[PDB]
Structures are given as C-alpha cells and as structure tokens.
Design an enzyme around this catalytic site. Structure first.
Site, PDB file in Angstrom:
ATOM      1  CG  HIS A 197       0.201   1.988   7.664  1.00  0.00           C
ATOM      2  ND1 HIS A 197      -0.735   1.044   8.018  1.00  0.00           N
ATOM      3  CD2 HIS A 197       0.432   1.802   6.342  1.00  0.00           C
ATOM      4  CE1 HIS A 197      -1.088   0.348   6.952  1.00  0.00           C
ATOM      5  NE2 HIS A 197      -0.377   0.775   5.925  1.00  0.00           N
ATOM      6  CB  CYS A 200      -0.926  -0.005   1.225  1.00  0.00           C
ATOM      7  SG  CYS A 200      -0.083  -0.377   2.779  1.00  0.00           S
TER       8      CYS A 200
HETATM    9  N1  LIG Z   1      -4.394  -4.328   5.083  1.00  0.00           N
HETATM   10  C1  LIG Z   1      -3.684  -3.496   4.323  1.00  0.00           C
HETATM   11  O1  LIG Z   1      -3.731  -2.289   4.489  1.00  0.00           O
HETATM   12  C2  LIG Z   1      -2.796  -4.038   3.233  1.00  0.00           C
HETATM   13  C3  LIG Z   1      -2.511  -3.245   2.126  1.00  0.00           C
HETATM   14  C4  LIG Z   1      -1.704  -3.739   1.090  1.00  0.00           C
HETATM   15  C5  LIG Z   1      -1.210  -5.021   1.190  1.00  0.00           C
HETATM   16  N2  LIG Z   1      -1.487  -5.790   2.267  1.00  0.00           N
HETATM   17  C6  LIG Z   1      -0.928  -7.151   2.287  1.00  0.00           C
HETATM   18  O2  LIG Z   1      -1.920  -8.089   1.855  1.00  0.00           O
HETATM   19  C7  LIG Z   1      -1.769  -9.320   2.585  1.00  0.00           C
HETATM   20  C8  LIG Z   1      -3.010  -9.610   3.392  1.00  0.00           C
HETATM   21  O3  LIG Z   1      -3.179  -8.539   4.304  1.00  0.00           O
HETATM   22  P1  LIG Z   1      -4.546  -8.405   5.108  1.00  0.00           P
HETATM   23  O4  LIG Z   1      -4.386  -7.067   5.826  1.00  0.00           O
HETATM   24  O5  LIG Z   1      -5.700  -8.666   4.157  1.00  0.00           O
HETATM   25  O6  LIG Z   1      -4.430  -9.640   6.112  1.00  0.00           O
HETATM   26  P2  LIG Z   1      -5.636 -10.395   6.882  1.00  0.00           P
HETATM   27  O7  LIG Z   1      -4.991 -11.066   8.045  1.00  0.00           O
HETATM   28  O8  LIG Z   1      -6.842  -9.519   7.055  1.00  0.00           O
HETATM   29  O9  LIG Z   1      -6.097 -11.539   5.856  1.00  0.00           O
HETATM   30  C9  LIG Z   1      -5.327 -12.741   5.685  1.00  0.00           C
HETATM   31  C10 LIG Z   1      -6.350 -13.830   5.437  1.00  0.00           C
HETATM   32  O10 LIG Z   1      -5.656 -15.020   5.018  1.00  0.00           O
HETATM   33  C11 LIG Z   1      -6.293 -16.131   5.657  1.00  0.00           C
HETATM   34  N3  LIG Z   1      -5.331 -17.247   5.689  1.00  0.00           N
HETATM   35  C12 LIG Z   1      -4.307 -17.448   6.550  1.00  0.00           C
HETATM   36  N4  LIG Z   1      -3.626 -18.578   6.204  1.00  0.00           N
HETATM   37  C13 LIG Z   1      -4.206 -19.093   5.099  1.00  0.00           C
HETATM   38  C14 LIG Z   1      -4.001 -20.245   4.204  1.00  0.00           C
HETATM   39  N5  LIG Z   1      -2.987 -21.107   4.455  1.00  0.00           N
HETATM   40  N6  LIG Z   1      -4.842 -20.418   3.139  1.00  0.00           N
HETATM   41  C15 LIG Z   1      -5.846 -19.563   2.897  1.00  0.00           C
HETATM   42  N7  LIG Z   1      -6.077 -18.489   3.687  1.00  0.00           N
HETATM   43  C16 LIG Z   1      -5.312 -18.205   4.756  1.00  0.00           C
HETATM   44  C17 LIG Z   1      -6.762 -15.613   7.003  1.00  0.00           C
HETATM   45  O11 LIG Z   1      -7.797 -16.429   7.582  1.00  0.00           O
HETATM   46  C18 LIG Z   1      -7.200 -14.189   6.664  1.00  0.00           C
HETATM   47  O12 LIG Z   1      -8.615 -14.121   6.351  1.00  0.00           O
HETATM   48  C19 LIG Z   1      -0.513  -9.140   3.415  1.00  0.00           C
HETATM   49  O13 LIG Z   1       0.604  -9.518   2.580  1.00  0.00           O
HETATM   50  C20 LIG Z   1      -0.459  -7.644   3.644  1.00  0.00           C
HETATM   51  O14 LIG Z   1       0.860  -7.159   3.900  1.00  0.00           O
HETATM   52  C21 LIG Z   1      -2.285  -5.338   3.276  1.00  0.00           C
END
Ligand SMILES: NC(=O)c1ccc[n+]([C@@H]2O[C@H](COP(=O)([O-])OP(=O)(O)OC[C@H]3O[C@@H](n4cnc5c(N)ncnc54)[C@H](O)[C@@H]3O)[C@@H](O)[C@H]2O)c1
Ligand SMILES: NC(=O)c1ccc[n+]([C@@H]2O[C@H](COP(=O)([O-])OP(=O)(O)OC[C@H]3O[C@@H](n4cnc5c(N)ncnc54)[C@H](O)[C@@H]3O)[C@@H](O)[C@H]2O)c1
Lengths: 331, 331
Positions: A176, A149
C-alpha cells in the site's frame, strides 16, 4: 440532484469533490475542514498526485465558487455545529477519519443532515457496504460506511473467485502507498509504532482488518480470510495479493476468464482486467476499485493460487463513495 | 588463509569485499571490473547505503592498498584473460551477473583459479547451495552457486517449518528493494518490460524463481512452492511473505517457538528472530540471511499461516558467499 456536504477536505474529501464534478446527480453545497476559504481553494487547485484541478476555482465573500456554484466553507471542529439543513445538504460524506462510530457520525444528523457515509471502516457495528458486492443489502439506515480502499479491492475479486470455484481459505497481503497518517521522518505514533517510522525510507508492516471485513460484506467468507499490509514509499496506488485455497479445481486461465467475464458484466465499472505489463503509476487516476493483473499472479496447482489486483486507493474509493451516496438516496 | 578473487565489483562484489575484512580465514588478492583503480578505490570508500568504508584505502602503482595489503586491479571484459594463478587466487567469486552457466564461469578455471562461486542462480544445472540448508551436500564440485538473496531468506525459514510441521504447499511474495538492473526513469528493458519502468515512482511486479529453487535445496519441497515479487522504491533490504498450508496443526505461538529454537541452535547466525516493531531500515547491515518477524505475520487457523521474514539482500547474502567459500575449501 442530491445535495451533499463533505466533512474533512483531505485526500478522500478532495478526490470525492473531484469525482463529483462529472456527475449530474450530485452537487457539493458545503465543505467543512480547519481551513480558511483561500487555503481550501489552493488545496483544491493544485495536487501533487493528480495534477491541477480542471475547473475554475475562486473565493468570493468567504465562499468557494467552483464552476459558478457557491459552496459554503466552514471550519467547525465539532460537526454538531454544522447547520447542514441551511444549505440543503441531505447526505454528508464523513471523511475526517475521526468520526467512525454511530455517536460521532450522528452529529451530522443533529446538525440537520438526513444520512451520513463514513469513508472508513467503522469502530462499531455501523453497517459497511461495498458497491457491486453487498450494497443491495441496504435497509434504509441513516448512517453507513463505505469500508476501506483495501476491502473495496479485495471484495469484488473474492466475490467472483468464491462464486465460481469456492474459497476454502485465503490470506491477503496489500502493498500500500504512503498515506497522511504516516510521518516524513521517524516521529511519534504511540498507537502504531511502525507507522511512525519515516515513510520514504522504509517498507513498513501494518495490521489491517480489511480481509476479515470481506466476511462481513460476503457472509459466506466469514472466518475464511485475513491478512496484513506493507506500506511502501509511493504516494498513491496500492495492490492486493490474495493467496487462496479453492474448493474446486481451476487452471489459471479459467480463473482469468471468470474475472474477465465479471469485469464485462455484473461488475463492469467496479472490477477491471488487464493483460498488459503494468506498474502502479499506470493505475493512477483509475476509478475502478479492483483491477485484476493477469500476468502478475501465479498458480501452484489447480486449487492453490496467488491473485494480484490493483487499486487507486484515492480515486476508486472516492468514486464509489459517491455511488453509495446515490444508492442510499434512491433506496 | 583462502586467497580469493572477485569478478564484478558491484553491490555484491563490494559487500563481499566488506564482509571479508573481519574474517581471518579469507584474503582478497585480486579484483576485476571495467574500472580504473582510482575509481575502484572511490567506489569502495563511499557507499550510499552502508556508509564510509572503515579501513584505509590507497591506490599505489595501479593496485589497491587496503589496510596495507596489495590487491591487483584488472579490467578484463573476458574472464578467460584474468591470470588468477599470478595472484594465487584459488576461489573466485563471480558477481558480474553475466556468467551464470558452467561454460562462462569455467573461464575462471581456464584463467588459473580452482573453484568458482556464482553469486546468483545458474541458468543451467550448476548446483546451488544455501548455508544452513544443503551446503553439507557439497561433493567437491569446481563450480557452484550461492543461489539468490531471496532463496537464502526463504530456504532457512521453509526448512524449519517443513521439518517441524510439514508444508503441504506454499506461495511466496517477496517485497524487494530496488537493484542495479532497474531504471531511474522509464527506460528500455526489452526482456523485462515492467522492470524498465522508473524504480522510485512505482510498485513493480516481477517474476522470481526463488521459491521454486527452494525445492532444489530442500528436495522434499520440490513442486510444493512457487511465488513472485514486487520491486519497491527502497535502496536495500527486502522481505519474504510465505503463505503456507501445514501438514499438522500448529498455533502461531508454536510456530514462533520453533523458529526461535532453530535461530538459537542449528541456524544460529543464519536465521534470526525478532519480536520488536521493526521496519526495513532496522535490518540494514544485518548479516543474517533470514530474520523472522513475530509481530508482522498472522495465522488464519492452525493449518494456514502467513510468515514474514526480512533480509538485507546485499549484506546477508554477501556474508554467506564467504561462508560457502570457506565451506567448499574445507570439504
Ligand atoms: N487516502 C486513502 O487512500 C483512503 C482510502 C479510503 C479511505 N480512507 C479513509 O478516509 C479518511 C480520510 O483519509 P484521508 O487519507 O483523506 O485523510 P487526510 O488526512 O488527507 O484528510 C483528513 C482531513 O480532515 C481534516 N480534519 C481533521 N479534523 C477535522 C475536524 N474536526 N473537522 C473537519 N475536518 C477535519 C484535515 O484537515 C484533513 O484535510 C480516513 O478514515 C481514511 O482511513 C483513505
Ligand atoms: N544486489 C542484490 O541484492 C543481490 C543479491 C544476491 C545476488 N545478487 C546477484 O549478484 C550478481 C551481481 O549483482 P549486483 O547487484 O552486485 O550487480 P551490480 O550491477 O551492482 O554489479 C555488477 C558489476 O559487474 C561489473 N561488470 C559488468 N560486466 C563485467 C565484465 N564483463 N567483467 C567484469 N565486471 C563486469 C559492473 O561494472 C558492476 O560493477 C547478479 O547475478 C545478481 O542477481 C544480487
């Protein structure tokens, strides 16, 4: 229509899902997480940050039915088991946070997909793309990353400033919002001690590679940027603070005029611009990846400036994940 | 002992009161606010941020009795009516936030006090002093200011960096705790629109003159620093992020060593130093005005660095108000 799978139905997974529901060119045909279908439906229906989902959601025979379309629900911890070709998923959005190397993300291709987009910066040399900055450098690779992000906010801004005036050197701070990696009360985070501390109680410094990553997507800035983060007690929306030394002089109004021009032209829909007295909640739900804040920043002199740009870290990034899916599918 | 009065028994007024109770050189003889004595006792006794007061607090004949000593309580809206001579108050701490000019502060002298310390930056050219930085420049003036919390954090840091390496130019951001000027939910703030928006919901950009003020307390830095602020949803403790271009090369380790040396010598008890994985709550109750955070900052190169320093905006500043009171009483 590009049929896609989502692996990891989290903040980004669900907001990517939401972002898809007003696009004609992309259809979600399967979702994998560690959840029963009824619980997945609940997580989609209700959202603390973004409100109730504005489509119909039901569960029929263990599948999600969203606005009439059946969506396969699986709970395979190992993505190699996913049989993506059976539901016709050609691109997988890899949004678990766990599979950020070639070897782990390639499990989706072992499972029948054609391409994968990681929703985080890679831990290896998987190429990163940022829409409006370097996506046209794509060369048909099966596995790519949409960066972070923060990189998606800084890169469009740095592109314009460097092109117009030149960045000699820059240091970035991002303030953040709290994320899912953090803890409600002081708890264990063995690889990130500060990040274990109670999120709602604290300003929490954190390392970030996002500024340095800008030099990968804008090679002219290689070695010319780095930074750090502070995590604070808000649930969504973040802000970049870029302090830059410029090659050529520019008044603050000239800088603002260049950004405004870019927001209306080449970076329309990506980089935005405001002169209003905004606060973070005003950007909640904004699909831009960078929103320049005219009144917030400040110049010391014609070659040393502090530039402020907002980003809804959930929403903007998620929309651009889908823009990248569409881009790599057509090229 | 130096007998003092406090005008404005707010966050600073009360934390100045608390800071006095282990000093043998300063005695509070009168407090003024817009409050009944019983309510003033309650405000002192209980504190959401700093816990219960660790002394006995009684109300008797409409005055406070604290640790067996009588303190006059008044509620004069106009400080000219305060009759400070009647309790022998020689110096008045002016902490209402409302009387930050010579003419307004001087009402305390009309009321029988001899000297006044404003607890914020003046709106005129009343001289500002920061302990450890320019307090030795004091020339016997009746009315002075202890500057702001933020200037008290940045000035000691800037002093060390400028003296050792030289600052060409610097830009500061402070990420600052919520304060009493802010609003619980979006409300009216006609002179500061962003600052009316709900404090606990938002990251809120804010102007600040604190970086420019460092140029008044360190004249060599005149015109070389400016900055801005973000207000965030924490109750206390703030942080300075100084991005500086240096006159000569220095590694990050050399910079840290210079700060450590200053913290052990000239600025002992003013500027501190940590190498631990700290977060904001770890500085709650710390009486230093600047706490340098080794692991949080970062150098891009040997002449461009981001330096991070914490401050308990309530506690540190309040202790230094009393140090300034003592200093001006002896010089
Ligand atoms: N939240 C943000 O602002 C943001 C922005 C850009 C990028 N990201 C990136 O995106 C990714 C996800 O972030 P998020 O904030 O959505 O995290 P999150 O924890 O909300 O979501 C992760 C999801 O993956 C699931 N999960 C875990 N292990 C798993 C598996 N083996 N198989 C299938 N599902 C599984 C969890 O149950 C959860 O619903 C990370 O790499 C994060 O750095 C996040
Ligand atoms: N809180 C901080 O972090 C901090 C740090 C450094 C400096 N300051 C400065 O110190 C000053 C006080 O700030 P605060 O945060 O303690 O504010 P505050 O609102 O907590 O306290 C102000 C007090 O003044 C009283 N008051 C109002 N009008 C009055 C009058 N006419 N006569 C007597 N009392 C009156 C109020 O009832 C209140 O108790 C401000 O100038 C502020 O900028 C604050």
């Amino acid at each position: 229509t590009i049929k896609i799978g989502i692996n990891g139905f989290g903040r980004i997974g669900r907001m990517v899902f939401r972002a898809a529901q007003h696009r004609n060119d992309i259809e979600i045909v399967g979702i994998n997480d560690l959840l029963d279908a009824d619980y997945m439906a609940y997580m989609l229906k209700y959202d603390s940050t973004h409100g109730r989902y504005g489509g119909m959601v039901e569960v029929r025979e263990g599948a999600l039915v969203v606005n009439g379309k059946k969506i396969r629900v699986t709970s395979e911890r190992d993505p190699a088991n996913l049989k993506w070709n059976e539901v016709g998923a050609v691109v997988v959005v890899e949004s678990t946070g766990l599979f950020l190397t070639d070897e782990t993300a390639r499990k989706h291709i072992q499972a029948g997909a054609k391409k994968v987009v990681m929703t985080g910066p890679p831990k290896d040399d998987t190429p990163m793309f940022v829409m409006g900055v370097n996506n046209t450098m794509y060369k048909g690779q099966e596995i790519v990353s949409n960066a972070s992000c923060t990189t998606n906010c800084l890169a469009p801004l740095a592109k314009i400033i460097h092109e117009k005036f030149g960045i000699v050197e820059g240091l970035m701070t991002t303030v953040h919002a709290t994320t899912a990696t953090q803890k409600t009360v002081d708890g264990p985070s063995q690889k990130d001690w500060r990040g274990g501390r109670g999120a709602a109680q604290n300003i929490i410094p954190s390392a970030t590679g996002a500024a340095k990553a800008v030099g990968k997507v804008i090679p002219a800035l290689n070695g010319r940027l780095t930074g750090m983060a502070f995590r604070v007690p808000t649930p969504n929306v973040s802000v970049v603070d870029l302090t830059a030394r410029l090659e050529r002089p520019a008044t603050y109004e000239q800088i603002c005029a260049a950004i405004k021009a870019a927001s209306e032209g080449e970076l329309k829909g990506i980089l935005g611009y405001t002169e209003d007295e905004v606060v973070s909640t005003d950007m909640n739900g904004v699909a831009l990846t960078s929103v320049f804040d005219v009144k917030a920043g400040i110049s010391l002199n014609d070659r040393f400036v502090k530039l402020i740009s907002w980003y809804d870290n959930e929403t903007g990034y998620s929309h651009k994940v889908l823009d990248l899916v569409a881009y790599i599918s057509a090229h």
